[PDB]
Symmetry: D3
Subunit: 242 residues, 6 copies
Amino acid sequence: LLRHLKISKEQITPVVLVVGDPGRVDKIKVVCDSYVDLAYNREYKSVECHYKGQKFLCVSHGVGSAGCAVCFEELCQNGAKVIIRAGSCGSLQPDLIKRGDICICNAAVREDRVSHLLIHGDFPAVGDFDVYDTLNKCAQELNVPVFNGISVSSDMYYPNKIIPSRLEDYSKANAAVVEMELATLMVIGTLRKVKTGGILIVDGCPFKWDEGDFDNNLVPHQLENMIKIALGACAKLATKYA
Amino acid sequence: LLRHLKISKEQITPVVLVVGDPGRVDKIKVVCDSYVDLAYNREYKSVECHYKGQKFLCVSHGVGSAGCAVCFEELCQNGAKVIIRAGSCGSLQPDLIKRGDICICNAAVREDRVSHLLIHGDFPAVGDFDVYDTLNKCAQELNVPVFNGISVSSDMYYPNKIIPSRLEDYSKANAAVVEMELATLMVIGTLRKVKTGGILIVDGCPFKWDEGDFDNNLVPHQLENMIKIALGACAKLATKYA
Amino acid sequence: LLRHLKISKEQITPVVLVVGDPGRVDKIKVVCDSYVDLAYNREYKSVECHYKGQKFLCVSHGVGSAGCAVCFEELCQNGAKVIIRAGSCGSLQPDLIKRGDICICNAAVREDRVSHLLIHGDFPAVGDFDVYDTLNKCAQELNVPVFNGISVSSDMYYPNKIIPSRLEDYSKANAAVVEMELATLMVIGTLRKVKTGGILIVDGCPFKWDEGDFDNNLVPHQLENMIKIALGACAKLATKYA
Amino acid sequence: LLRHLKISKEQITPVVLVVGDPGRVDKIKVVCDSYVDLAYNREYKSVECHYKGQKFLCVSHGVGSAGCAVCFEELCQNGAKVIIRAGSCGSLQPDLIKRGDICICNAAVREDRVSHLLIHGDFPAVGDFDVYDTLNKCAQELNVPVFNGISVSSDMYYPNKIIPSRLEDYSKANAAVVEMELATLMVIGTLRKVKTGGILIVDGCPFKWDEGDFDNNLVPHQLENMIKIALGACAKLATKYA
Amino acid sequence: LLRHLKISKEQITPVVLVVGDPGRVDKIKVVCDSYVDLAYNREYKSVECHYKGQKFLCVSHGVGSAGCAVCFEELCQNGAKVIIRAGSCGSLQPDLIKRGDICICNAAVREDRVSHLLIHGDFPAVGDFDVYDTLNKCAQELNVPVFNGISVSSDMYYPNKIIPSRLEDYSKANAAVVEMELATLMVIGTLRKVKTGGILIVDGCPFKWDEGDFDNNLVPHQLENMIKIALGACAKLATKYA
Amino acid sequence: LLRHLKISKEQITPVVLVVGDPGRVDKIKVVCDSYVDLAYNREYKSVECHYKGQKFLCVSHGVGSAGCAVCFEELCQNGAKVIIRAGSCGSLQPDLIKRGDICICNAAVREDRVSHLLIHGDFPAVGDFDVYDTLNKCAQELNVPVFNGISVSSDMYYPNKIIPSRLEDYSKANAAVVEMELATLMVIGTLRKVKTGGILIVDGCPFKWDEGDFDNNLVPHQLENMIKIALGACAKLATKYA
Ligand SMILES: C=C[C@H]1CN2CC[C@H]1C[C@H]2[C@H](O)c1ccnc2ccc(OC)cc12
Ligand SMILES: C=C[C@H]1CN2CC[C@H]1C[C@H]2[C@H](O)c1ccnc2ccc(OC)cc12
Ligand SMILES: C=C[C@H]1CN2CC[C@H]1C[C@H]2[C@H](O)c1ccnc2ccc(OC)cc12
Ligand SMILES: C=C[C@H]1CN2CC[C@H]1C[C@H]2[C@H](O)c1ccnc2ccc(OC)cc12
Ligand SMILES: C=C[C@H]1CN2CC[C@H]1C[C@H]2[C@H](O)c1ccnc2ccc(OC)cc12
Ligand SMILES: C=C[C@H]1CN2CC[C@H]1C[C@H]2[C@H](O)c1ccnc2ccc(OC)cc12
């Protein structure tokens, strides 16, 4: 079995959907055509999903870059060819990107440490074009409007008052949203020859937390739509390996 | 309630025992005199422990620095005065520190990113003396031999072959062991005026993974002893606030 | 007029093709349907191209990031909406990417300085999806095989023997090719809300310069094909603004 | 003889008290039971102290990290097992830590360069627990109140107005005091398997130098008390090797 | 021939005058006693100048550090012993250094990337004394007042509003002027055992661009004087090798 | 009085000769025409020298950058206009620069920390031309051969085996010699509008310490010659202010 995911090597499928919360895996599996529970160790919950005639895993990665890298590395080392992250994020453009909007991301800010322990900082955190295109084409089929943009993947959720957060700089640089894992996924994927992407639902705006605008309200219909897009994309991408 | 731990603010006790695996919380609570299950959200499982006449929380932090910082910040922001981490680690001194040995750590290598987003790199990751002394005195009472030393807290579990891992440098520098969260705990604690410490059980040696010497075997009697020391210390420290 | 390009502000078109060598501008204009010479100052030669019913500039940027940034900034500040770089590059994968092969790049290594004087290093150098897709679809129409991949954009052409070149690290990281300007273009474009891309012809392999495998032979038919793809893409993208 | 200290190798004792000013060595020796003058070269004055039945050296290190490292390295290379620094420092918490207060430090900010030329910045500057405990227990025996905390060891005494001093950041981070050598001592000690500590007398507050609150007044009774604590600790620690 | 300069190796003279603009080479050659056009490739224009009985090349380097390094390396690799840059620059001391003033520079700020890819940042960008002395003595002979000082060689011409430009810091540090290539020249020269210098004409002040005080007016008589000084110096230095 | 030098402000002369060892001040004063002892505090010994009709101070700075900066700042803040350092150094070119050779330095490697706490790393550590010229012209008058070159000013005297020393890199970069203070002097001088220089006697070669080639033998006649050159230069420079 995989060292920490505890799934057997034979159970790794070419396409894998990753999400942060183990609870979310259980909410996703029930919208599929069927599923098989595989393993649950620590924050890493794994389920084989069957959807639109195809088979792909759904696996939880936990909160944050160092914990997710364990997950991503084990998947890449054991046969995953495509990894899509579906997650939540905060808006960095509060005039234009609002609660419940959906972002399909192509690139990310490497505000982690593990990516830098693997490759020099100059190297880009970028997703695969094809995966990105597939996500966007599924959103278009379902008539679900989306945003595209760069995510800031930051290891600091709660800022302090000594070293300024770089969020406002990145907003000024036209980064769309903020989350905690996509850059890490993208860099590990490039290093390991695994295609990656990301789709995110907006939940709040960090620049408006002092007015209670937190990440505490996933708009249920929007969340459903994102999950449909994510599952759709997985199934289409899975067709090529099947 | 706490934003992500989902425990009420009134339920935060002055002493908190933190561990990585939510499963471990359930294995610890049953050795206490009694417990009350509080919350379980994502990888964060919280239980109020009653032991030796005192009351303290036990909370899981997940794998890795960015995820644990969410936990630690919420505890520090909402009344925790003392936080002890009990965890596993890898030996960096394989001639002297073997499987199942126990290390009580006073300081850590800041091979994360969140600590650096809070305070300049020059700042030390150090535990509180008193907590460290309390842990050591509990180990002495129970006649459990221990090691003391510095932990390397690294965000990279799986190294690649491009950028060398710094583990061998840190071994040469006399770091004892390697894990993934203690530096983060220590720096947040200093910033927030919360006393911190760490006790760790050795599980393998990264320098001998090519010969199967992994972190996959917690020596059961040694693990029990460490948990007894950790609970003992918590109860003693809790007496001062009670 | 533009401060250093010396073209009038009214002459900036929404799509601009950029190339390094002022000589190349003169070789490109003659394959268009017609052209108007605009300005030539320093290494910056500007010509208005007419191709497939559309109008776009072709402008030389010179060798290297700091010099090209002057060009790119003036174009972005004065109305350019899309900038495609067509250039030469060296292979970083000599088993697979050979002389005369064509690469359509989506992202780049920021081994410059100007990008870092504009935005933190963690920020990705990424092209626009749409531009990348347009280039690839033009190559497919013309039946011209291409490679896709990340470019290392390095400010050092001639390495010395004291500080190792990072080319081999980036090859190991799966970077495809090496050139000198694309990262700079990409970052300025993101900062300025200008869509960017890159198409490159392989000319040699730096890892085989000790055996004379230099950047001194642009395969003439391959160069023609790349230029056709680049012009094709420009014309298609120009249609949206016209 | 030692290369720069000029003391013979046979004269190095297991415990060594270090101080900045060669003049201070002469003021310390006369409070001991007896002494033997050993060497005086450059700013490095060495005297063998006899106190409470034990024998330990007292050696001056000069002002600043690079000069003190020469001293510390020679002592560590030639048999020193324990090194305590006794020095002066500035308050970083002027509401709570006043002129003449005494701080027993456990850790330090590495705002030097030599420590970084020996080991990566992430590594902590931490003292030995036992030494720290011994100092604190001697202060308690003598009924001398003390502070405990982190020292900022900075190579810049006189700030200029271009690059902000980091003192206010470190004050906000709960650093207690500022001096110039302790981090250097601590890191060399960890690297060389030598136990280290630090005791410091407060002399001024850098944040109030514009109002004349300089380091120009060592409160004589407080200085005596600190020196008594330092000598006491040395003698107790020396007992273990004797 | 030289790889990118396209001049033959036999045509490299011991002294070389370098300038940014290929147009400037043509304006310089006509003030010499005679000249021979050698090559023009990309932005690199080369002419053999005959002046005061001596022979030296004049070669254009283009805008910016990465492009100029190609030029400088090829000259240093193929026999150049002395390289003087004559260029334009911006004032960083607008009270004292005005439009058209002439600066003979001895050292430079390394705000590039190629110098850092060749040697650690701590290493100084410094010119040769002798070259500097020769320039100053030629200015004195011709009765042309000059300034001496440090140049900031920055790869960013157009600053943005996210990361502050360091120009004001360097002004406060007593840097005289700003340009884009001298540091690069100086470091390559030291690495290659080639003597270097720099003479610059002031054209504007970046701190007053918001009031139109741009680099768009080379005072014609002052420019003539600088070029006379530069040619004078070249001829004197050339005498030693002839 | 000066805060730490303890000399009165009225006693600061426009030219100051600085040396590391307080003992050396006493050996220099006796070769002057006469002297007046001024102050001796810590490692800082100050004497007013009278030589060739002029008056200048000689002041000891101690070992290392952070300690010397206190000295240099106080001199620059209180009227010093010219500061020459005379010191010892190690050869980085053992084939060409031998024991007892004399180097007159124009620039330095900033391998300290205080310079970086005052100004960005890109800024050069360079001496004043005039001072350098004066030193060289005094050596020529006295028929004393000298070397000129860049000094590596490093805060680490005793390297360890974890992080490689940069000495060999700097040797390859054509640095001549190694010492511990000149860069610091040069940067403080530029910041404070004080002219600086450096003259150094070679004592050993760090690359040959494993064969006993230490800094433990100042060739007495060569040392005399250097001191004569240094005093000569001071007197000439002092004439301009007198
Ligand atoms: C327990 C942690 C959770 C908190 N937020 C939702 C999912 C988990 C990670 C995080 C997310 O990255 C995110 C969403 C929305 N707004 C955010 C704002 C800031 C941010 O900083 C890293 C992360 C945000
Ligand atoms: C799913 C992750 C787990 C893997 N190891 C056990 C607990 C979790 C974190 C990690 C631990 O830090 C650790 C223990 C033992 N040897 C290790 C060796 C290397 C190491 O690198 C960060 C971490 C080690
Ligand atoms: C005068 C400079 C030219 C030299 N090469 C061709 C175009 C200009 C820039 C460079 C190009 O980036 C490139 C092409 C092919 N192989 C290369 C290998 C190394 C490289 O390093 C920056 C650049 C390469
Ligand atoms: C000649 C130098 C002396 C000056 N101060 C007293 C002892 C020597 C070092 C320094 C000390 O670290 C110190 C004490 C008190 N207040 C300080 C404030 C600032 C500081 O910055 C490094 C050092 C301070
Ligand atoms: C096309 C580029 C040109 C623009 N300026 C004149 C010559 C070329 C380079 C630059 C010069 O370095 C310079 C001169 C005057 N003022 C300047 C102000 C700022 C500056 O920033 C690098 C460069 C300046
Ligand atoms: C107590 C310290 C002394 C030791 N050496 C002589 C004077 C003082 C400083 C040092 C000098 O910088 C120096 C001279 C000769 N060879 C050296 C080799 C290495 C070096 O590293 C900083 C310094 C050297």
